[PDB]
Design a binder for this molecule. Structure first.
Ligand code: NA
Ligand code: NA
Length: 319
DNA sequence: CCGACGTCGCATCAGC
DNA sequence: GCTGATGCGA
DNA sequence: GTCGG
């Protein structure tokens, strides 16, 4: 319908992020892309698009140029620019953001092949990102996620049957595929006013599910895992595990379940009901707008009750 | 006209 | 060596 | 780049 347009805008979004380092222009173009990607008509003019929220004068102008000419002179030009296309490309490596990508390209390091010849200039994160560059850009089919989940919950329970672990993200909402695995972990002994993560990562490495570590501290692990394999080996996958204190666990599960759009509406509703919800806690707003103490939460539902909404199933939380 | 555009954990850098 | 800033990803 | 106080 409007794929020419959404791809044009997504493309522009990446050059702002990765090349111009203008994070707010990346989000402007991304949000324009989203609003158009959902508009149920073939767009005829920039003025038509302009009516949608997220589309201003400058994107209206660019849509007019695309509609009339079938391209955008500025994109054509930036696309063919050696420096910029290279910088934009390198940022597809996990661990290389806009600033490292610039630095590499400044010194002549432009390609994956170049990165491979210069391992010594790569931090640990970036080396892992390069090693699995292709695997990381693959989606994970639900079936595989179900098998990953089988392993995580088994090994977690076996370290201590009192841990609670929940796989969140779009998988928890029922998506047919996923980009990574986001595990939320708590234990009754860990509260806000209270090695729990390390023992779980350790057991997942002992059975060779976790193959690599990007980062790991007392509350957050980010790394790489692989299902056990005649068959061709499974792709390596991104898994994060976070340890959240129990009295904030369900605020965390609700947040990390999303979608983004749902959480936004839920936060809207709560405000009008005189509550403030974030990732950690729900709190009452006083008459002048002063937030008081976090309220006890023991299930997701508790949160919905506080703001007089009806428990919605992960499956029904796209908006 | 002009500021907001989430916020934070970890790894690593820059300054002292 | 210590502390706070930065880059990055989420 | 877009919105909005
Ligand atoms: Na508009
Ligand atoms: Na990157």
């Amino acid at each position: 319908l409007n794929g020419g347009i959404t791809d044009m805008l997504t493309e522009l979004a990446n050059f702002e992020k990765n090349v111009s380092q203008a994070i707010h222009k990346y989000n402007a173009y991304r949000k324009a892309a989203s609003v158009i990607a959902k508009y149920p008509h073939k767009i005829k003019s920039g003025a038509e698009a302009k009516k949608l929220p997220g589309v201003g004068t400058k994107i209206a102008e660019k849509i007019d140029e695309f509609l009339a000419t079938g391209k955008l002179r500025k994109l054509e030009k930036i696309r063919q620019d050696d420096t910029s296309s290279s910088i934009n490309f390198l940022t597809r490596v996990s661990g290389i953001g806009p600033s490292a990508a610039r630095k590499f390209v400044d010194e002549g390091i432009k390609t994956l092949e170049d990165l491979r010849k210069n391992e010594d200039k790569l931090n640990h994160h970036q080396r892992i990102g390069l090693k699995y560059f292709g695997d990381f850009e693959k989606r994970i089919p639900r079936e595989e996620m179900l098998q990953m989940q089988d392993i995580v919950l088994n090994e977690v329970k076996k370290v201590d049957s009192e841990y609670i672990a929940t796989v969140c993200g779009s998988f928890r909402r029922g998506a047919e595929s996923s980009g990574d695995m986001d595990v939320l972990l708590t234990h009754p002994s860990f509260t806000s006013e209270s090695k729990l993560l390390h023992q779980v990562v350790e057991q997942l490495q002992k059975v060779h599910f976790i193959t690599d570590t990007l980062s790991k501290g007392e509350t957050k692990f980010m790394g790489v895992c692989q299902l056990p394999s005649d068959e061709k080996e499974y792709p390596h996958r991104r898994i994060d595990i976070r340890l959240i204190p129990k009295d904030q666990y369900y605020c965390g599960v609700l947040y990390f379940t999303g979608s983004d759009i749902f959480n936004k509406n839920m936060r809207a509703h709560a405000l009008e009901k005189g509550f403030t919800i974030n990732e950690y806690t729900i709190r009452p707003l006083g008459v002048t707008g002063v937030a008081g103490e976090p309220l006890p939460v023991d299930s997701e539902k508790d949160i919905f009750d506080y703001i007089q909404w009806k428990y919605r199933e992960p499956k029904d939380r796209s908006e």
